[PDB]
Design a protein around this motif. Sequence first.
Motif, PDB file in Angstrom:
ATOM      1  N   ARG A 183      17.850 -39.946  98.609  1.00  0.00           N
ATOM      2  CA  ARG A 183      16.493 -40.352  98.248  1.00  0.00           C
ATOM      3  C   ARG A 183      15.793 -39.270  97.421  1.00  0.00           C
ATOM      4  O   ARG A 183      15.810 -38.093  97.774  1.00  0.00           O
ATOM      5  CB  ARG A 183      15.681 -40.676  99.504  1.00  0.00           C
ATOM      6  N   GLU A 238      13.937 -40.297  91.130  1.00  0.00           N
ATOM      7  CA  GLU A 238      14.913 -41.342  91.407  1.00  0.00           C
ATOM      8  C   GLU A 238      16.009 -40.945  92.401  1.00  0.00           C
ATOM      9  O   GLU A 238      16.392 -39.776  92.501  1.00  0.00           O
ATOM     10  CB  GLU A 238      15.502 -41.910  90.108  1.00  0.00           C
ATOM     11  N   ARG A 295      17.724 -39.715 115.859  1.00  0.00           N
ATOM     12  CA  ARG A 295      17.986 -40.340 117.148  1.00  0.00           C
ATOM     13  C   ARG A 295      19.462 -40.262 117.527  1.00  0.00           C
ATOM     14  O   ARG A 295      19.907 -41.003 118.385  1.00  0.00           O
ATOM     15  CB  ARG A 295      17.540 -41.804 117.131  1.00  0.00           C
ATOM     16  N   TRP A 300      21.858 -43.054 118.568  1.00  0.00           N
ATOM     17  CA  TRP A 300      21.567 -44.255 117.790  1.00  0.00           C
ATOM     18  C   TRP A 300      22.660 -44.506 116.761  1.00  0.00           C
ATOM     19  O   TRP A 300      23.034 -43.608 116.014  1.00  0.00           O
ATOM     20  CB  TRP A 300      20.235 -44.068 117.070  1.00  0.00           C
ATOM     21  N   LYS A 321      22.786 -47.760 114.916  1.00  0.00           N
ATOM     22  CA  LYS A 321      22.494 -49.025 114.253  1.00  0.00           C
ATOM     23  C   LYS A 321      23.123 -49.099 112.858  1.00  0.00           C
ATOM     24  O   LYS A 321      23.638 -50.147 112.454  1.00  0.00           O
ATOM     25  CB  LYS A 321      20.985 -49.250 114.147  1.00  0.00           C
ATOM     26  N   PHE A 322      23.083 -47.980 112.134  1.00  0.00           N
ATOM     27  CA  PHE A 322      23.584 -47.924 110.771  1.00  0.00           C
ATOM     28  C   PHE A 322      24.969 -47.266 110.658  1.00  0.00           C
ATOM     29  O   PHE A 322      25.454 -47.018 109.552  1.00  0.00           O
ATOM     30  CB  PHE A 322      22.565 -47.205 109.886  1.00  0.00           C
ATOM     31  N   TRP A 344      18.392 -38.775 109.265  1.00  0.00           N
ATOM     32  CA  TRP A 344      17.683 -39.808 110.016  1.00  0.00           C
ATOM     33  C   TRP A 344      18.621 -40.954 110.366  1.00  0.00           C
ATOM     34  O   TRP A 344      18.573 -41.486 111.477  1.00  0.00           O
ATOM     35  CB  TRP A 344      16.459 -40.347 109.247  1.00  0.00           C
ATOM     36  N   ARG A 345      19.464 -41.338 109.408  1.00  0.00           N
ATOM     37  CA  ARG A 345      20.329 -42.503 109.582  1.00  0.00           C
ATOM     38  C   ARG A 345      21.741 -42.260 109.047  1.00  0.00           C
ATOM     39  O   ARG A 345      22.516 -43.206 108.914  1.00  0.00           O
ATOM     40  CB  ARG A 345      19.737 -43.733 108.884  1.00  0.00           C
ATOM     41  N   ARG A 395      23.860 -44.814 107.042  1.00  0.00           N
ATOM     42  CA  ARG A 395      23.052 -45.558 106.070  1.00  0.00           C
ATOM     43  C   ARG A 395      23.297 -45.067 104.640  1.00  0.00           C
ATOM     44  O   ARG A 395      23.328 -43.858 104.394  1.00  0.00           O
ATOM     45  CB  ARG A 395      21.575 -45.398 106.433  1.00  0.00           C
ATOM     46  N   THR A 431      21.696 -46.785 101.685  1.00  0.00           N
ATOM     47  CA  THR A 431      20.788 -47.472 100.767  1.00  0.00           C
ATOM     48  C   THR A 431      20.044 -46.563  99.768  1.00  0.00           C
ATOM     49  O   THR A 431      19.646 -47.021  98.693  1.00  0.00           O
ATOM     50  CB  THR A 431      19.788 -48.362 101.533  1.00  0.00           C
ATOM     51  N   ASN A 432      19.849 -45.293 100.121  1.00  0.00           N
ATOM     52  CA  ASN A 432      19.222 -44.335  99.209  1.00  0.00           C
ATOM     53  C   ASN A 432      20.248 -43.489  98.453  1.00  0.00           C
ATOM     54  O   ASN A 432      19.879 -42.574  97.728  1.00  0.00           O
ATOM     55  CB  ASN A 432      18.267 -43.393  99.954  1.00  0.00           C
ATOM     56  N   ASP A 489      26.518 -49.529 103.795  1.00  0.00           N
ATOM     57  CA  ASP A 489      26.511 -48.562 104.886  1.00  0.00           C
ATOM     58  C   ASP A 489      27.938 -48.419 105.420  1.00  0.00           C
ATOM     59  O   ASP A 489      28.745 -49.344 105.301  1.00  0.00           O
ATOM     60  CB  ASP A 489      25.594 -49.019 106.029  1.00  0.00           C
ATOM     61  N   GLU A 494      13.877 -51.514 105.884  1.00  0.00           N
ATOM     62  CA  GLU A 494      14.724 -50.628 106.687  1.00  0.00           C
ATOM     63  C   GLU A 494      14.270 -50.438 108.140  1.00  0.00           C
ATOM     64  O   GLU A 494      15.106 -50.240 109.029  1.00  0.00           O
ATOM     65  CB  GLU A 494      14.844 -49.268 105.987  1.00  0.00           C
ATOM     66  N   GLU A 536      17.414 -55.053 105.453  1.00  0.00           N
ATOM     67  CA  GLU A 536      17.537 -54.879 104.012  1.00  0.00           C
ATOM     68  C   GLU A 536      16.243 -55.119 103.227  1.00  0.00           C
ATOM     69  O   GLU A 536      15.388 -55.914 103.628  1.00  0.00           O
ATOM     70  CB  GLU A 536      18.704 -55.703 103.450  1.00  0.00           C
ATOM     71  N   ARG A 550       5.053 -48.604  92.123  1.00  0.00           N
ATOM     72  CA  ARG A 550       6.451 -48.327  92.471  1.00  0.00           C
ATOM     73  C   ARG A 550       7.203 -49.609  92.845  1.00  0.00           C
ATOM     74  O   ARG A 550       6.687 -50.433  93.604  1.00  0.00           O
ATOM     75  CB  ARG A 550       6.482 -47.341  93.639  1.00  0.00           C
ATOM     76  N   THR A 607      10.906 -49.557  93.573  1.00  0.00           N
ATOM     77  CA  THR A 607      12.257 -49.221  94.022  1.00  0.00           C
ATOM     78  C   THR A 607      12.706 -49.895  95.334  1.00  0.00           C
ATOM     79  O   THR A 607      13.906 -50.074  95.558  1.00  0.00           O
ATOM     80  CB  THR A 607      12.453 -47.693  94.108  1.00  0.00           C
TER      81      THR A 607
END
Lengths: 372, 372
Positions: free
Chosen positions: A32, A44, A277, A293, A295-296, A328-329, A345, A347-348, A358, B34, B44, B345, B347
Motif C-alpha cells: 500500500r 500508488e 491479530r 487470526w 481470515k486472509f 495487519w493481514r 492478504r 489486495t494492496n 490472497d 476489506e 472485496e 480518490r 483506488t
Amino acid sequence: VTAPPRKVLIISAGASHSVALLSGDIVCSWGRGEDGQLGHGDAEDRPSPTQLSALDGHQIVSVTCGADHTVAYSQSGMEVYSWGWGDFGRLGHGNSSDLFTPLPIKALHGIRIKQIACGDSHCLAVTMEGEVQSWGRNQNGQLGLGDTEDSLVPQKIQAFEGIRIKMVAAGAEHTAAVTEDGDLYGWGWGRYGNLGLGDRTDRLVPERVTSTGGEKMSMVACGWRHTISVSYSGALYTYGWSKYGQLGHGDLEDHLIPHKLEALSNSFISQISGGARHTMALTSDGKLYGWGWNKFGQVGVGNNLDQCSPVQVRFPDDQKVVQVSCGWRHTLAVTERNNVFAWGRGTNGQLGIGESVDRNFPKIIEALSVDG
Amino acid sequence: VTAPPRKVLIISAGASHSVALLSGDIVCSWGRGEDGQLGHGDAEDRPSPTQLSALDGHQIVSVTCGADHTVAYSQSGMEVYSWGWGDFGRLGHGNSSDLFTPLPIKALHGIRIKQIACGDSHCLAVTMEGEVQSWGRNQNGQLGLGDTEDSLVPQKIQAFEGIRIKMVAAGAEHTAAVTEDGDLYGWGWGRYGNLGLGDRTDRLVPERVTSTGGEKMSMVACGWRHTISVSYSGALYTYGWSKYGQLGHGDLEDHLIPHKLEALSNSFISQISGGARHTMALTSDGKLYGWGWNKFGQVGVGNNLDQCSPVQVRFPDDQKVVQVSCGWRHTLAVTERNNVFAWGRGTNGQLGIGESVDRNFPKIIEALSVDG
C-alpha cells in the motif's frame, strides 16, 4: 552471468506494506502506497518490490515499518529517516505533515542508534548506550514520558535513567522493553492486559513486569493489542488480547500477566513477531510457527481458519526460516537459501508477487529470491 | 421501457466506502470492502454500486457511514443494523467482532430513532424524544458518559437529561450536538480546539459552547479533527484543525472557538459535511462549495492543490446540488436531476464509476443517475 540476488538482510511488515534491506545498502518497498509509506514520491500501491532510489548511497543499515509509515537509519551518517502518514507526529519532524519521500529526523542527527521500533502512531529509538527516545501519539501514555500529550519530536524517557535498555517494541498504542539484564517493562494503553502488569489500567511511564517466574527476558515484540516475550531459556510468553487466539494458549481468553505457551515448551524460541491479530515464533533450528487470526491466510498453514495454538508453517524442502515479520493481514519470511516468502492478504500488493489473489500458504517472491 | 432510476434518498461517505439509500427501501454500497463495511458477506472492494440484498424488504429509511463501518435503521421495524470493523465496540453488539453482513443492534430494538451519527470508532443515536445514546471507543471521553472506558453497547448520555437534542455529529474521536433550541455542545478529544470551548483540553461529558455570538445553531457536522456549524441566519462557523485549510478562513491556523467563515457571509448555508481534511457547504439555492485537502482531487474544483478558502464545485448545466457527503479522500453529491456524482480518490472503487483513475472534478455515477 547475471549476478546472484542481493542478500536479503532485513524484512519488515507494516499494516499493508512491506520493506526490505538488501546487501549493498539497498532499500526496497512494496504494498500500500496511499499514505506515502513506500517513499517513492507517488501515492500508488506497488505489487512488486520497488527500489527506493532516494536512499541509494545513503548507507542504510536498518529499516522498520510502523502501521502506515516507515523508518530507516544509517550508522555511518548517523541519520534516521522517516516517511508516510504524519498524524500526531509519528514521523518525528516537529510537525504532522505526511511525507511521500524520506526525510531525515533532525532531532536524531549524530546520535548512535541501536534500534528503532514503530507502532501504529508512535515510535521509539534505543541508543548504543541503552537510552530511549520516543515520539508521536501519547494519548494513553505510550511514549512513557509521564503525561498524555503527543510529542512531535523525539524526547528522552527519563524514567530509564541508569537502566540500560536492550530493545523496545510498540503495538497500536502500547509499548514494551527489555533491559540488558533481563527485566521486562510495559506502558501505554493497557485495557486488554497487554502491559503484563496484572490489570487493565494504562501506565504513563514504564513499569516493570514482576510476574516472570524469576525468569529473565531476552526479547520482546508487540502485536496490535498483545505482547510476546522470550526468556533466557527460550521459553515463549504471551499476554494481552486473545480474541483471535493470538496468545496461542488453546483458547480465546486474555491474559493480564505473561503466560508461558506450554505447547512450545520443548522448542527453543529465537525470534518473535506480532501482527495485528496473529503471531509468529521462530525456533533455534529454523522452524516457524504461526497462530491467531487467519481470515486472509496470514497464518500460512493452508487454510482460512483461525488457529488458537501454534501450527508449523511449511516451506519447500523444509528449508529453515531465518527471519519473520507480521503485518495487519500478511506475513513475510526469509529462509536460509536467501529466498523471501509472503502470505496472507494481497489486495494492496503487499505480498510482492505481482498482481495476485490472497495466499494461505507461503509464496516465493521471485524478485528477491534465489529460487523460482 | 425500463423504469426510471430509483430516487436517491440518502448518500453517505465513509473513509473509503460509499453507501446510498434508494426509493423502495433499497440499500447499495461500494468502495473498500476489506473490513466488511459494504455488508455483502465477502471482503472485496466493489467499484460499482452493489445492492445489499440482506436488507431487501427490511424497510430501511436511513444509512450512515463511519470510517470503516456502516449503520442503517428501519422506522417501521424499530431496528438498527450495523456492520464492518468491530474494534472497541463501534458496532454496538456487546462484543468487538467484525461483521461482514448486517446484524441488528439488540440494545436499540423497539426504540424510536431520529438520527444516527458515526465517527471513526464511536457512534451515537438520537431518539424521537431527543435523548442520546452512545457506544464504542471512549478513551478521550467521546461517548460523553463521564469516564474513559469503551462501551460495547449503547448507553444513555445522562448529562442531557431534560435537554432535547436535535442532532449529533462525530469526528475521529470527538463529538458535537445541537439542541432543539439552538445550543451547541462539544465533547471528547479536544487537542486541536475542535470542541469549540476555547482551549485544547478533552471533555468527558458534553459541554456547552458559549462563544456563538448569541447566535443559535441549527446544525452541526464533524470532520476528522474539525467541526462545522450553521446558525439560524445561515451563517457558517468552523473550528478545530486547519492544517489543510479545512476551516476555510484563508489560512492554516486552528481556531479554538467557532469562527464565522466571512467569505460565505452573503450565502445562506443549508447543509454541511466534514471530511477527514476537507469540507463541503451547500447553499439554500443549491450551490456547493468545497475547501481543504485536495491531494486526490476531493475538493472537486479541477486541480490537486489544497484550498484554504471556499471554491464553488461546478456541475453540468449548473444543476443544483441537493445532498453532499465527504469521506477521507472522496466526496459524493446528489443533484436536483436525480444524478449522483463522485470525485476524489478512486483506488478502492469508492467513486462508484467502475475501475477508474482518481478524479478532480465531479463524475457522474451512471448506475444511479438519470443522465449519462
